[PDB]
């Protein structure tokens, strides 16, 4: 069976870290918070497979750079992204370069679907896995 799910989130804000993990509180969740983005690389650099879902916040400036390394080393996981506009405006349609095509998106005030999203992110990533992580 499945023992637990490994989720590595990267967020420098406790509220975001708490709301992102709060939803992901299932008894089978292993949330790992990364104080930085480089720290997340070391964690994903030695257990990509052990990671079941990565949480990322686009609100960060060099966040994409940190994600590029995950894709750079080939670390691809059902990564849920936070921070997406809710307008169909073509100026900011939310590009999918934050991570790979398997990454899922989560509204900033929608912190709660992470658990259900994780299950969707896992299935969405497995079907697409291996995903295209050209960063």
UniProtKB/Swiss-Prot annotation:
* Keyword line: Biological rhythms
Q: List the disulfide bonds.
A: none
User: In what residue span(s) does the KaiA N-terminal domain sit?
Assistant: 1-135
Region annotation (PsR domain, binds oxidized quinones) ranges: 1-135
Induction field: Transcribed in a circadian rhythm with maximal expression at 12 hours and minimal expression 12 hours later; has its own promoter. Protein levels are fairly constant (at protein level). Rapidly forms aggregates in the presence of oxidized (but not reduced) quinone analog DBMIB (2,5-dibromo-3-methyl-6-isopropyl-p-benzoquinone), an artifical electron acceptor for photosystem II that reduces the plastoquinone pool (at protein level). Aggregation is irreversible, and prevents KaiA from stimulating phosphorylation of KaiC.
Top-rank lineage group of the source organism: Bacteria
A single GO BP: entrainment of circadian clock
Q: Name one GO molecular function term.
A: identical protein binding
Which effects follow disruption of this gene? Not essential for growth on low light, loss of circadian cycle and rhythmicity.
What family is this protein classified in?
Belongs to the KaiA family.
Self-association state and partner proteins as the record states: Homodimer. The KaiABC complex composition changes during the circadian cycle to control KaiC phosphorylation. Complexes KaiC(6), KaiA(2-4):KaiC(6), KaiB(6):KaiC(6) and KaiC(6):KaiB(6):KaiA(12) are among the most important forms, many form cooperatively. The KaiA:KaiB complex is only found at 20-24 hours in the circadian cycle (subjective night). Binds to the C-terminal A-loop of KaiC via a coiled-coil structure. KaiA and CikA compete for binding to KaiB(fs). CikA copurifies with this protein in the clock complex. Interacts with LdpA.
**Function, in words:** Key component of the KaiABC oscillator complex, which constitutes the main circadian regulator in cyanobacteria. Complex composition changes during the circadian cycle to control KaiC phosphorylation. KaiA stimulates KaiC autophosphorylation, while KaiB sequesters KaiA, leading to KaiC autodephosphorylation. KaiA binding to the KaiC CII domain during the subjective day yields KaiA(2-4):KaiC(6) complexes which stimulate KaiC autophosphorylation. A KaiA dimer is sufficient to enhance KaiC hexamer phosphorylation. Circadian oscillations can be generated in vitro by incubating KaiA, KaiB and KaiC with 1 mM ATP. The cycle is self-sustainable for at least 3 cycles and resistant to temperature changes. A very robust clock is reconstituted with KaiA, KaiB, KaiC, SasA, CikA and RpaA; output is measured by transcription from an appropriate reporter.
Notes concerning its domains: The homodimer has swapped domains; the N-terminus of one monomer interacts with the C-terminus of the other.
Q: What else is known?
A: 'Kai' means 'cycle' in Japanese.
Q: What is this protein called?
A: Circadian clock oscillator protein KaiA
The organism that produces this protein has a lineage beginning with: Bacteria, Bacillati, Cyanobacteriota, Cyanophyceae, Synechococcales
Gene that produces this protein: kaiA
């Amino acid at each position: 069976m499945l023992s637990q799910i490994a989720i590595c989130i990267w967020v420098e804000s406790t509220a975001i870290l708490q709301d992102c993990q709060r939803a992901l509180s299932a008894d089978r969740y292993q949330l790992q918070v990364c104080e930085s983005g480089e720290m997340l690389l070391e964690y994903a650099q030695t257990h990509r497979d052990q990671i079941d879902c990565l949480i990322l916040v686009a609100a960060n400036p060099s966040f994409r750079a940190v994600v590029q390394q995950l894709c750079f080393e080939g670390v691809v996981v059902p990564a849920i992204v936070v921070g997406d506009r809710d307008s169909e405006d073509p100026d900011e349609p939310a590009k999918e370069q934050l991570y790979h095509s398997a990454e899922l998106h989560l509204g900033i005030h929608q912190l709660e679907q992470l658990p259900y999203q994780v299950d969707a992110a896992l299935a969405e990533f497995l079907r697409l896995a291996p995903v295209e992580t050209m960063a």
